[PDB]
């Protein structure tokens, strides 16, 4: 909480136009107008062995090219 | 008309209707073009000009509780012309996960009736 307490200070005490993109920006989402929303990328382990029908992509590990 | 698009959209789905009208599309052209290329045309209107990928590696990517019936009306398609060996066992050619028949998809997605 602390290191947590300081690191948003250092970025209120930035006003710049924020060039440390710290995330994936307008990762589109599954509705097709609302191609916005700036996501994350994460990963889990074994459990709940399944078919899983709910995808986005042609599953590669990072972006294609 | 992009047949190869109206193809890959008609198995995400899986309506074996429309399935069966491209089917009966495709193979109408092949008849028209009875040539030198009635094994590789038909085979490069299956193949992804990208990815290497085919209507079957498409189809085992989006799984559908009518699918058993979709890829048999398909591998029935690829008797018809003489084309199944070289279309069941078509890789991944795009080398980025190289070498993946569909077959690869089928245990992945924990089908094994179908596989």
Redesign the interface.
């Known amino acids: 909480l602390q290191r947590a307490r300081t690191i948003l200070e250092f970025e209120k005490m930035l006003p710049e136009w924020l060039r440390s993109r710290f995330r994936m920006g307008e990762l589109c989402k599954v509705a097709d107008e609302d191609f916005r929303l700036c996501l994350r990328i994460n990963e889990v382990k074994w459990t709940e062995?399944?078919?899983h029908?709910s995808?986005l992509n042609?599953?590669?590990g990072p972006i294609?090219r | 008309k992009r047949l190869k698009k109206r193809i890959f959209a008609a198995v995400s789905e899986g309506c074996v209707e429309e399935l069966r009208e491209l089917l009966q599309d495709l193979q109408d052209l092949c008849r028209r073009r009875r040539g030198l290329d009635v094994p590789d045309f038909l085979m490069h209107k299956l193949t992804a000009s990208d990815?290497g990928?085919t209507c079957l590696m498409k189809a085992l990517?989006n799984?559908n509780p009518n699918t058993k019936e979709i890829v048999r009306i398909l591998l029935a398609f690829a008797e018809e012309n003489d084309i199944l060996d070289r279309f069941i066992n078509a890789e991944y050619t795009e080398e980025?996960?190289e070498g993946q028949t569909a077959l690869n998809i089928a245990i992945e997605?924990?089908?094994g009736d179908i596989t």
């Open positions: 062995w399944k078919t029908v995808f042609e599953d590669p294609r | 990815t990928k990517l799984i980025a996960y997605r924990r089908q």
